[PDB]
Amino acid sequence: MKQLTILGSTGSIGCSTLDVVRHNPEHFRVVALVAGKNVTRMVEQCLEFSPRYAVMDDEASAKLLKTMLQQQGSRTEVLSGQQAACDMAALEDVDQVMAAIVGAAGLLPTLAAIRAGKTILLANKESLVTCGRLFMDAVKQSKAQLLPVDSEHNAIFQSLPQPIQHNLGYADLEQNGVVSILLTGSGGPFRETPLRDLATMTPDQACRHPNWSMGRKISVDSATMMNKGLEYIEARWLFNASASQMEVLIHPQSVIHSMVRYQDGSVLAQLGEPDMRTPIAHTMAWPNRVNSGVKPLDFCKLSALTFAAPDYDRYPCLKLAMEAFEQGQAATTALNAANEITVAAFLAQQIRFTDIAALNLSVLEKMDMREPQCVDDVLSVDANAREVARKEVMRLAS
Amino acid sequence: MKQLTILGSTGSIGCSTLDVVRHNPEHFRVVALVAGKNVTRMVEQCLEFSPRYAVMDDEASAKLLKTMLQQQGSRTEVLSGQQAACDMAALEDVDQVMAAIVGAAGLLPTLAAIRAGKTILLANKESLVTCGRLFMDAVKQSKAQLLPVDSEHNAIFQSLPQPIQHNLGYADLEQNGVVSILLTGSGGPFRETPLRDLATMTPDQACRHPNWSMGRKISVDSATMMNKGLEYIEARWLFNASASQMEVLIHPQSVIHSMVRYQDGSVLAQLGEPDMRTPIAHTMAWPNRVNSGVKPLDFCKLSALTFAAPDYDRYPCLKLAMEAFEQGQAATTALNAANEITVAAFLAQQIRFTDIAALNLSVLEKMDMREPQCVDDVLSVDANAREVARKEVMRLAS
């Protein structure tokens, strides 16, 4: 029986996680839930899973949640604030922590889960893009077990050897028969449009906080393969791989989610339906399995599997991301920050598509910052880079 | 440092095994070699790997080998006979035993390797088709570690969880997250013709004892998918899977060598070049890896990956093999024996292609034997079935 804390229970990953709990009330039990302002949804989950505690963004929200739960017979106790989240991640009884809170707000709470040595279900992969060094170091110390939730990372993890799985982050690939990691993907035709996505979003698989403004940034990051690059930066930290132990492959149908190349010629891969309950069910039941309510992949109703090396010429960002990794976390944090701004600039037609990679590049060159020492320097580099990218994006719009 | 005995060192699998030893003289050391009448080749390997002992088919051969080795300064000692082979498989210093001796001659020596609790590199998969119960039972007792050498089995094994890998044969799939095993293949167009094979056989990768008469039986067994069925019977013993935990998929390009379906929706697969040094290098270095001198699979120079459920109507044998498994090892041994005879009958145009499945079927029905208790009853059922299939094949040719 595994007890767990969910950081960001009112997002896509959150409800997905709970549904795995729902189908397996005999293997899991929510100890605490953490969210932002979504009171209504929070109440639902508390009534259904009877968590010990529940944390919201601010007290105004905590109070409302505290009232509704009260006038509805709920033993759950309510708290609020960032520190309370961090404390929820370190509770003694907690075995796993689903780190599904994106952005800065997710850094400290996630770091505290590691500090405490909890099994960490990494679902905010974007945090390794900036605090890769910090998180991975802290992991090495507490021996906290990392289990990637993202689709490709989880595929790689599932395809690696036991010794590397049990010591994710600080093990050695050469010593364990691993020649390279094959990060797969598809972007250009950037897999699917945010338009076709909205059209096929069913009435229950929409726990994902709306924000249409985001699905657009994602598709742009997918057209420039900047998303592949962040996956690259991330993959290198998690698996502790070198530039020469990484291989990027374009795979259109997305059936194979990523693979691992071995010394004897063998290559291991994980395949499956695009449902996020598979990766999630995997990390939660590791090192065993559980049903996630996902359909078995049907090999008869599939399209041909294709592969191709990316054309680093049509997609400068991917090469730019791979290059920043070599320049350290200051470079990666900067690259990420500038991209946020330049992509927004492009959507707001202030610049052209092609200027994204250009501006991103110019920004990295104009900056000269040191390697972030803690979550606070990362944020400093972040904010510092967002400023330059802005002073730049306007000097062009003129 | 792993010391090993090779049973059948002058065949395709044998030299392949030694080449893995050749590239890794720091991880392996041949303790003894076993072969038949190929004196010349035996001498080569003894001079190159300095085995402690060498065993041949009969003394005439042992004497010749003993002379040539002698008049060429070889400390290796020579023996002959079946019992000597069995003794070579049970030597204290031996860590692994490459069981690459096909047919009846391979049963006892392989059984003795298991009895002794050696790590068994199963390369004569056809032995599980008749003594599945015997071998698997004996394995369970000595805790001998089985490591399948065949392409699909090794792919499945590599794609299974640790607990099942470390206890191959007697573990439970349900309990370890495994829903089913996906045995892949291709036969009709039966992959490649023995004609196109001869044409592309290079001057060094021809350690395979000639016998063109065999490559033909293989292609016929591939056109009737009787080979898929034996893979099925075998796969069930090794992985201890039920009829419902087996799925047969047709996969033309043979890049994916087989896969495993999991409870959470994940499916694991192993891919690679068709070279037998990969599976071999894997079983020898398990649970770690070693270089096998096989080229890394190039995903850029591949053809589209296709899958399809087999049409059990066009290929009765596959359905027949799956059905015999349910009837026990008497049925499977019989099915195999009759097939030998009927396929030979077809090549010798005494019957038609379509009569193979028919005759195979009639034979199973006309027989009523008990479950083989030991290697001797299996041989009895075998010989008993070969006789019927003959009395039948001639009543038709009339």
Q: Which helix (H) or strand (E) holds A250?
A: strand A246-250
Residue labelled with tokens 């090396």 = A309
The two tokens of residue A300 are 């008869």
Is the backbone peptide bond immediately before B189 cis, with ω within 30 degrees of 0? Answer: yes
Neighbouring C-beta atoms of residue A233, cutoff 10 Å:
23
The residue count of chain B comes to 398
The runs of H, that is alpha helices, within B160-276 are 162-165, 194-199, 212-223, 226-239
Tell me which residue of B107, B137, B99, B97 sits closest to B240, measured CA to CA: B137
- Domain segments of chain A as ranges: 1-150, 151-311, 312-398
Q: Which helix (H) or strand (E) holds A122?
A: strand A119-122
Burial status of residue A27 (CB atoms within 10 A of its CB: 0-12, 13-18, 19 or more)? middle
Which of A 218-277 lie inside 8 A of B, CB atoms? 249, 259, 261-273, 275, 277
Contacts of B178 in chain A (CB under 8 A): 289
Tell me which residue of B188, B337, B325, B318 sits closest to B248, measured CA to CA: B318
Alpha carbon distance A81, A76 (integer Å): 17
* B356 touches B224 (CB < 8 A): yes
User: Nearest Cβ partner of B267 from A161, A265, A271?
Assistant: A271
Specify which residues A268 forms β-bridges with. A260, B270
Specify which residues B98 forms β-bridges with. B6, B121
Neighbouring C-beta atoms of residue A15, cutoff 10 Å:
21
Instruction: Write the single-letter amino acid at B215.
Output: G
DSSP letters for B230-254 = HHHHHHHHHHT--GGGEEEEE-TT-
Q: How far is CA B83 from CA A338, A344, B57, B88, B146, in A?
A: 75, 78, 11, 9, 22
Alpha carbon distance A375, A104 (integer Å): 9
State the best of A263, A282, A288, A300 to mutate against chain B, taking most chain B CBs within 10 Å. A263
Q: How far is CA A102 from CA A98, A108, A109, A151, in A?
A: 12, 11, 11, 16
State the best of A246, A264, A291 to mutate against chain B, taking most chain B CBs within 10 Å. A264
Residue labelled with tokens 């006892």 = B108
DSSP letters for B14-36 = HHHHHHHHHH-TTTEEEEEEE-S
State the best of A17, A173, A176, A266 to mutate against chain B, taking most chain B CBs within 10 Å. A266
Residue labelled with tokens 């056989």 = B201
Alpha carbon distance A112, B142 (integer Å): 47
For residue B38, the distance in angstroms to the closest alpha carbon of chain A comes to 29
* A252 touches A188 (CB < 8 A): no
Q: How far is CA B328 from CA B164, B239, B381, in A?
A: 23, 16, 12
The two tokens of residue B42 are 């035996």
For residue A271, the distance in angstroms to the closest alpha carbon of chain B comes to 5
Based on its alpha-carbon atoms, the radius of gyration of chain A, rounded to whole angstroms, reads: 21
Alpha carbon distance B177, A386 (integer Å): 46
- Contacts of the segment B304-307: beta carbons below 8 A, 24+ positions apart: B304/A304, B304/A305, B304/A306, B304/B253, B305/A304, B305/A305, B305/A306, B305/B251, B305/B253, B305/B255, B305/B256, B306/A304, B306/A305, B306/B251, B306/B252, B306/B253, B307/A299, B307/A300, B307/A302, B307/B184, B307/B249, B307/B250, B307/B251
Specify which residues A180 forms β-bridges with. A261
Q: How far is CA A327 from CA A368, A369, A375, B314, in A?
A: 11, 10, 18, 60
CATH of B312-398, one of 1.10.287.3510, 1.10.1740.10, 1.10.10.10, 3.40.630.10: 1.10.1740.10
For residue B141, the distance in angstroms to the closest alpha carbon of chain A comes to 26
Q: Is A12 annotated as a binding residue?
A: yes
The residue count of chain A comes to 398
Q: Is B151 annotated as a binding residue?
A: yes
Which of B 299-328 lie inside 8 A of A, CB atoms? 299-300, 302, 304-309
Q: How many helices (H) and strands (E) does chain A have?
A: 16, 11
Q: What angle do CA B34, B39, B44 make, to 5 degrees?
A: 85
Residues 6+ apart with CB under 8 A from A26: A1
Contacts of A28 in chain B (CB under 8 A): none
Buried b (16+ CB within 10 A) or exposed e, A273-305: bebbbbbbbbbbbbeebbbbbbeebebeeeeeb
User: Nearest Cβ partner of B269 from A249, A269, A308?
Assistant: A269
Residue B298 near chain A (CB below 8 Å) = no
Phi/psi at B6 (nearest 5 deg)? Answer: -115, 120
* B337 touches A328 (CB < 8 A): no
Q: Are strands A267-271 and A256-262 parallel, antiparallel or unpaired?
A: antiparallel
- Contacts of the segment B350-358: beta carbons below 8 A, 24+ positions apart: B350/B393, B350/B394, B350/B396, B350/B397, B351/B393, B351/B396, B351/B397, B353/B220, B353/B223, B353/B224, B355/B396, B356/B220, B356/B224, B356/B226, B356/B317, B357/B224, B357/B316, B357/B317, B357/B320
Q: Are strands B178-185 and B246-250 parallel, antiparallel or unpaired?
A: parallel
Contacts of B266 in chain A (CB under 8 A): 158, 270-272, 278, 282, 289
Neighbouring C-beta atoms of residue B36, cutoff 10 Å:
18
A308·B300 Cβ contact <8 A: yes
Q: What is the dihedral of CA B87, B93, B98, B103, to 10 degrees?
A: 10
Alpha carbon distance A205, A151 (integer Å): 17
Task: Identify the sign of the CA torsion B84, B86, B89, B90.
Answer: negative
Q: Which helix (H) or strand (E) holds B289?
A: none
Q: Are strands B77-80 and B2-7 parallel, antiparallel or unpaired?
A: unpaired
Say what angle helices A226-239 and A212-223 make with each other, to 10 degrees.
80
Alpha carbon distance A338, B308 (integer Å): 47
What is the biggest distance separating any 2 CA atoms in chain B, rounded to whole angstroms?
A: 64
Contacts of A263 in chain B (CB under 8 A): 281, 289-292
The two tokens of residue B335 are 């099915």
In the PDB record, what is the listed experimental method? X-ray
Tell me which residue of A31, A12, A104 sits closest to A378, measured CA to CA: A104
Nearest C-alpha in B relative to A260: B270
Say what angle helices A39-49 and A12-23 make with each other, to 10 degrees.
20
Neighbouring C-beta atoms of residue B130, cutoff 10 Å:
27
Alpha carbon distance B304, B301 (integer Å): 10
- Measured between its terminal Cα atoms, the distance across chain A in Å is 61
Residues 6+ apart with CB under 8 A from B361: B316, B320
The runs of H, that is alpha helices, within chain A are 12-23, 39-49, 59-70, 82-89, 104-115, 128-142, 151-159, 162-165, 194-199, 212-223, 226-239, 277-285, 316-326, 329-347, 355-366, 375-397
Nearest C-alpha in B relative to A271: B267
Residue B394 near chain A (CB below 8 Å) = no
The two tokens of residue A30 are 């929510």
Tell me which residue of B98, B85, B127, B307 sits closest to B230, measured CA to CA: B127
Instruction: Write the single-letter amino acid at A372.
Output: P
Neighbouring C-beta atoms of residue A268, cutoff 10 Å:
25
Q: Which CATH architecture has domain A1-150?
A: 3-Layer(aba) Sandwich (3.40)
Alpha carbon distance A49, A59 (integer Å): 22
State the best of B266, B283, B284 to mutate against chain A, taking most chain A CBs within 10 Å. B266
* Residue B168 DSSP symbol: T
Specify which residues A4 forms β-bridges with. A30, A96
Q: Are strands B178-185 and B256-262 parallel, antiparallel or unpaired?
A: antiparallel
Which of B 176-215 lie inside 8 A of A, CB atoms? 176-179, 182
Nearest C-alpha in B relative to A281: B264
Nearest C-alpha in B relative to A249: B299
Alpha carbon distance A222, A227 (integer Å): 6
Instruction: Write the single-letter amino acid at B16.
Output: S
